[PDB]
Paper text:
STEP is a brain-specific PTP, and a validated therapeutic target for Alzheimer’s disease, Fragile X syndrome, and Parkinson’s disease. To compare the effects of temperature vs. pressure on the STEP catalytic domain, we used similarly prepared crystals to obtain three complementary crystal structures: one at cryogenic temperature (100 K) and ambient pressure (0.1 MPa), one at physiological temperature (310 K) but ambient pressure, and one at high pressure (205 MPa) but cryogenic temperature via high-pressure cryocooling. All three structures have the expected PTP catalytic domain architecture, including several key loops surrounding the active site region.
One notable feature of our new structures differs from the previous STEP structures: the active site binds two sulfate molecules. The bottom sulfate is well-coordinated by the catalytic P loop, analogous to the phosphate group in the phosphotyrosine (pTyr) substrate in PDB ID 2cjz41. In our structures, as supported by strong electron density, Cys472 predominantly adopts a side-chain rotamer that points away from the sulfate, thus avoiding a steric clash. Taken together, these observations support the interpretation that Cys472 samples both a rare primary rotamer and a low-occupancy alternate rotamer that is sterically mutually exclusive with a fortuitously observed sulfate bound at high but non-unity occupancy. Thus, although previous structures of STEP have sulfates or phosphate-like chemical groups independently in each of these sites, no previous structure has them in both sites simultaneously. In our manually modeled, deposited structures, LoTP has by far the most waters, HiT has by far the fewest, and HiP has an intermediate number. First, at LoTP and HiP, an ordered glycerol molecule is bound near α2′ and the Q loop. By contrast, at HiT, ordered waters are present instead, and α1′-α2′ and the Q loop undergo conformational shifts. Importantly, all three structures are from crystals treated with similar glycerol-containing cryoprotectant solutions. It is thus plausible that crystal cryocooling induces the glycerol to bind, preventing nearby conformations with potential functional relevance seen at physiological temperature.
Numbering used by the authors: 256 to 537
């Protein structure tokens, strides 16, 4: 909707101009959802944040266990277009709360999601995210989740997981990124860029028409928007030799209100893309 195509030089300078960045960022409408849209008793129990709600056109609806029950079928999640508008590359969702852990896994099963990206720091567990995976094994509304392996790396912990419901077995990779910075300075960009590249490469290993990749921290918009915007713009940089973070943010906002919630987040994406362009140029 809005657009600012950045070539390399402007990109490096734009990332370092916070006055222009906030001018640009706060012109982007949030596109938040009127809470009246989900006037369903008990629904507020499924939301972490009463005013961060899934836009209805892109909302993920659960069909299990009662599709005729608007509360049973509700999850605070949206399909998110990827690079070039490709449909349903991601699902942005809130960190599960105790009342929605089973819903979250129902989503993962329903959507054939191969990859979860969790952008939540150690400190913020059981406040910004319920530990929704087992030590080894656990079962939710019919799907058995088995953590087969944990790979620790500097920037993230990767769990290899198996999901079994009845006769069907599927794999899942759970990337738990733990280096989200408090200060979104350029020295903190490399781990995010690394994660984006590792995830986009895991995604390619799933083959054609990869099922949606679930991305979350707490509300499903801020860090989640940063990760998705960075992933999209990395493809844009590789394919087009430019980045349009403003247009990408608008595309994200159209899918889910509030994606990239803070100007510090918005500037961080620019720091990450500036770093990546330098890497690519060598």
């Amino acid at each position: 909707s809005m657009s600012r195509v950045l070539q390399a030089e402007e990109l490096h300078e734009k990332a370092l101009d916070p006055f222009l960045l906030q001018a640009e960022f706060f012109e982007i409408p949030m596109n938040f959802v009127d809470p009246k849209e989900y006037d369903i008793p008990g629904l507020v129990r499924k939301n972490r944040y009463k005013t961060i709600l899934p836009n209805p056109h892109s909302r993920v609806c659960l069909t299990s266990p009662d599709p005729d029950d608007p509360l049973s079928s509700y999850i605070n999640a949206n399909y998110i277009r990827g690079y070039g508008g490709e449909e349903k590359v991601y699902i942005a969702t809130q960190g599960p709360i105790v009342s929605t852990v089973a819903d979250f896994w129902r989503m993962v099963w329903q959507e054939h999601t191969p990859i979860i990206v969790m952008i939540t720091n150690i400190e913020e567990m059981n406040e910004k995210c319920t530990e929704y995976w087992p030590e080894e094994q656990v079962a939710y509304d019919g799907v058995e989740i088995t953590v087969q392996k944990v790979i620790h790396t500097e920037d993230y912990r990767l769990r290899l997981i198996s999901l079994k419901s009845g006769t069907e077995e599927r794999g899942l990779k759970h990337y738990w990124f733990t280096s989200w910075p408090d200060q979104k300075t350029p020295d903190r960009a490399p781990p995010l860029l690394h994660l984006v590249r590792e995830v986009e490469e895991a995604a390619q290993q799933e083959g054609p028409h990869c099922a949606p990749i679930i991305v979350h921290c707490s509300a499903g918009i801020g860090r989640t928007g940063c990760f998705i915007a960075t992933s999209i713009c990395c493809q844009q940089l590789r394919q087009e030799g430019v980045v349009d973070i403003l247009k990408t943010t608008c595309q994200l906002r159209q899918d889910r209100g509030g994606m990239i919630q803070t100007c510090e987040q918005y500037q961080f994406v620019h720091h990450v893309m500036s770093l990546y362009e330098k890497q690519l140029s060598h």
